[PDB]
Design a protein around this nucleic acid. Structure first.
Length: 121
DNA sequence: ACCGCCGGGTGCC
DNA sequence: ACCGCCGGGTGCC
């Protein structure tokens, strides 16, 4: 994880919107999360891009509705890997790891819990 | 029936 | 989408 950061934990979620983008992913490959704040459908949007810099999709809206605050306030840095399903039609799984400063670790977990998510090992 | 259930239309954010 | 969700059509046994 990033130099000087604590592992907060992990979450399994999904990339969606795959039919609308040309970015490809390989199984077991890293992806990049990027805030998408001017998306005209959802101000909390977070896009998922592949390592080369091509959009793959979006985080599911409910997860983005929890994570936008975390990204905007820089409470965690989030890493993503697609474990399998890279050629799925509609949705693919995403393993996310959350990293940051100890002083923000409970704030991140509390934000997630407010939206029905929880970190695990 | 102000219900539960069924199934057609539908589909990111 | 082989799903979840939405809402129109529907209705005892």
């Amino acid at each position: 994880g990033p130099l000087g950061s604590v592992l907060f934990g992990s979450l399994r979620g999904h990339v969606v919107g795959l039919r609308y983008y040309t970015g490809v992913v390989n199984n077991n490959e890293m992806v990049a999360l990027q805030r998408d704040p001017n998306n005209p459908y959802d101000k909390n949007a977070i896009k998922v891009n592949n390592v080369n810099g091509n959009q793959v999709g979006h985080l599911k809206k409910e997860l983005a509705g929890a994570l936008a605050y975390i990204m905007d306030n820089k409470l965690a840095q989030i890493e993503g890997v697609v474990p399998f399903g890279a050629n799925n039609a509609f949705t693919m799984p995403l393993h996310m790891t959350f990293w940051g400063k100890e002083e923000n670790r409970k704030a991140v977990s509390d934000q997630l819990k407010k939206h029905g998510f929880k970190l695990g090992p």
